[PDB]
């Protein structure tokens, strides 16, 4: 029942989030294409695996890809640049591609089954990534008349994500193309993260960089 924390790689971004990404909660990052959402997702996929003193929870990660954003070659560079074995870091990230919105919900029943199997092991799942959470729902429910249903399907998927985060004590990290964090391009390849409407965290901004290590100050 202790709320775990995952470092994002950047200490200024971790400060804004009150210590990092929370287990038993969903953290949403939104912004335009190229604002760093997937780089943050890839950095977290590595960070989670690290011991607490280094910013992780000694866990494994699951990655649900909706629009082919997963880059194992990028995860290998981040693992290498942080002094880890890239093939071992890769082995600890379960990847699954969602082809449609209904397949996306079905993937959560598979994540649930996988989480149970790895629960007693020395490396339980501590992170679930959903890259471009809303892309399939917007593709399939177009126009004024399918707005009610899209919102209904989306709310249902969010209810499911909340249940998994609470019963397995995992962080859920979701990305959303343009807890909520707005990402934006800053000056000189810098990125600005702005925290919006957090109940117990003040609004503020955090500037960070995209490097060979993924995300850092």
Residue numbers in the entry: 108 to 285, 311 to 349
Paper text:
We focused our attention on human RAD51, an ATP-dependent recombinase crucial for homologous recombination (HR) and for error-free repair of DNA double-strand breaks. We therefore explored the possibility of using a more stable orthologue as a surrogate and focused our efforts on archeal RadA from Pyrococcus furiosus, a protein that was already structurally characterised and is closely related to human RAD51. Here, we describe the complete process of generating robust, RAD51-like surrogate systems from this archeal protein via two distinct approaches: by stepwise mutation of the surface of the RadA to humanise the BRC4 binding area (HumRadA series of mutants) and by generating an archeal/human chimera (ChimRAD51) in which all of the BRC4 binding part of RAD51 is stabilised by parts of RadA.
The humanisation series could have ended with HumRadA22, which displays a fully humanised BRC4 binding surface. The crystal structure of HumRadA22 confirmed the success of the humanisation process and shows good agreement with the human RAD51 structure. The structures of those mutants, where the LFDE site has been humanised (HumRadA14 and 22), show good correlation with the human BRC4–RAD51 complex in this area for the backbone but some variation in the side-chain conformations. Despite extensive efforts, we were unable to obtain a crystal structure of a complex of a HumRadA mutant with a BRC repeat, and differences in the BRC4 binding site are likely to reflect the unliganded state of our proteins. Whilst it was possible to obtain apo crystals of the fully humanised mutants (HumRadA22), the crystals were difficult to grow and handle and hence not well suited for drug discovery purposes.
